[PDB]
Amino acid sequence: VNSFSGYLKLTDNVYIKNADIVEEAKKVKPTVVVNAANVYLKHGGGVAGALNKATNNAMQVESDDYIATNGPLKVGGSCVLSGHNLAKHCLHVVGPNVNKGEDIQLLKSAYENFNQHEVLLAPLLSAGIFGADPIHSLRVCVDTVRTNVYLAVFDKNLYDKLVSSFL
Ligand X SMILES: O=C(NCc1c(C(=O)O)[nH]c2ccccc12)c1ccc2[nH]cnc2c1
Residues that bind ligand X (CB under 6 A): 20-22, 36, 46-47, 50, 123-124, 127-130, 134, 153-154
**Which is nearer to ligand X, 76 or 134 (by Cβ)?**
134
Shortest separation between residue 67's beta carbon and ligand X, angstroms:
19
CB-based contact 153:162 (threshold 8 Å)? yes
33 class by beta-carbon count within 10 Å (0-12 exposed, 13-18 middle, 19+ buried) = buried
**Which is nearer to ligand X, 33 or 124 (by Cβ)?**
124
Q: Which residue is nearest to ligand X (CB)?
A: 128
**Which is nearer to ligand X, 81 or 162 (by Cβ)?**
162
User: Each residue of 52-90: b (16+ CB within 10 Å) or e?
Assistant: bebbeeebbebbeebeeeeeebebbbbbebebbebbebb
Shortest separation between residue 21's beta carbon and ligand X, angstroms:
5
Taking the mean position of all CA atoms in its chain, how far away is CA 129? 13
Per DSSP, what are the bridge partners of residue 149? Answer: 14, 120
Indicate the helix (H) or strand (E) that contains 18: strand 14-18
**Which is nearer to ligand X, 30 or 128 (by Cβ)?**
128
Shortest separation between residue 1's beta carbon and ligand X, angstroms:
26
Shortest separation between residue 48's beta carbon and ligand X, angstroms:
7
Q: From CA 129, how far away is CA 121, in angstroms rounded?
A: 19
Shortest separation between residue 153's beta carbon and ligand X, angstroms:
5
**Which is nearer to ligand X, 114 or 154 (by Cβ)?**
154
